[PDB]
Amino acid sequence: FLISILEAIEPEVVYAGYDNSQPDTTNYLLSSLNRLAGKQMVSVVKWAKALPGFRNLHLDDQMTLIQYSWMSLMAFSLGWRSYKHTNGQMLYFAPDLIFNEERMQQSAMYDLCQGMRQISQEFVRLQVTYEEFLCMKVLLLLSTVPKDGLKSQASFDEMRMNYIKELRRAIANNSSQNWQRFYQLTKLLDSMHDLVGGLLQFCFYTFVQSQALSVEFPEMLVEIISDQLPKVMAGMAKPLLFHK
């Protein structure tokens, strides 16, 4: 039922509104992705609010969690779309904006693009199911927290454990085979932190020099990044890992 609910609140595909008549310069590609991110942020916030348990958290905890995990959420979903639509060969940012070798090159962030493609490749290797993906995505929203704790810690812990259990349900082969899959899927979850660290570094860097580098960011993103950046830079957040 919880899983059936996740299927129901899963956001509909978001288009980039990309204009292919324009040259694919780094400035245009990055600005287009930032605009896409803004549109995706709207879907993310709406999705989170509809998530069983999220509403029970303090308003500040809700904002904090979205602020710290939006990049991981979008990168993970990108990995899923690329997996389903291109078997992990291209980055399916949006139906109207798919990154091939050429775009990855002109984006000036080829390596980060490959890091994200590696996620899709893991989905392929493990043949991640839609149910597993849905539960894992919720866990990402609940895997980067303030070092000083949350206001509704108790409720948070309970929520997190519920979705972890839901994930094991999706996984459920004998018990040892289920354990192995839990091990592998949570290894994938933990791997998101390092990738996201690199994604956020370039995001913050281009954000800080948005005007000078002519890389546009929509208001939906500017507000969030403006607040998130200092917190992250000061080392106020920490990951909730599944492995040593």
Ligand X SMILES: C[C@]12CCC(=O)C=C1CC[C@@H]1[C@@H]2[C@@H](O)C[C@]2(C=O)[C@@H](C(=O)CO)CC[C@@H]12
Binding site for ligand X (CB under 6 A): 30, 33-34, 36-37, 40, 74-75, 78, 93, 109, 112, 199, 202-203, 206, 215
- Can you say how many angstroms the Cα of residue 145 is from the centroid of all Cα atoms in its chain? 15
Nearer to ligand X among residue 121 and residue 162 (C-beta): 121
Angle between helices 219-233 and 175-208 (to 10 degrees): 100
18 interface partner picked from Na ion, ligand X, none, CB below 5 to 8 A per type? none
Nearer to ligand X among residue 86 and residue 155 (C-beta): 86
Residues that bind Na ion (CB under 5 A): 60-61, 64, 121-122, 125
Nearer to ligand X among residue 189 and residue 199 (C-beta): 199
60 interface partner picked from ligand X, Na ion, none, CB below 5 to 8 A per type? Na ion
CA torsion angle 189 190 193 198 (round to 10): -90
Q: In 3D, which of 48, 86, 43 has the Cα closest to residue 66?
A: 48
Count of Cβ atoms closer than 10 Å to residue 177 Cβ: 11
170 interface partner picked from ligand X, Na ion, none, CB below 5 to 8 A per type? none
As measured in angstroms, the least distance from the Cβ of 162 to ligand X is 27
82 interface partner picked from ligand X, Na ion, none, CB below 5 to 8 A per type? none
What is the C-alpha separation between 188 and 190, in angstroms, rounded? 5
Count of Cβ atoms closer than 10 Å to residue 228 Cβ: 23
Cα dihedral 207, 211, 212, 217 sign: positive
Nearer to ligand X among residue 93 and residue 123 (C-beta): 93
As measured in angstroms, the least distance from the Cβ of 122 to Na ion is 5
As measured in angstroms, the least distance from the Cβ of 88 to Na ion is 8
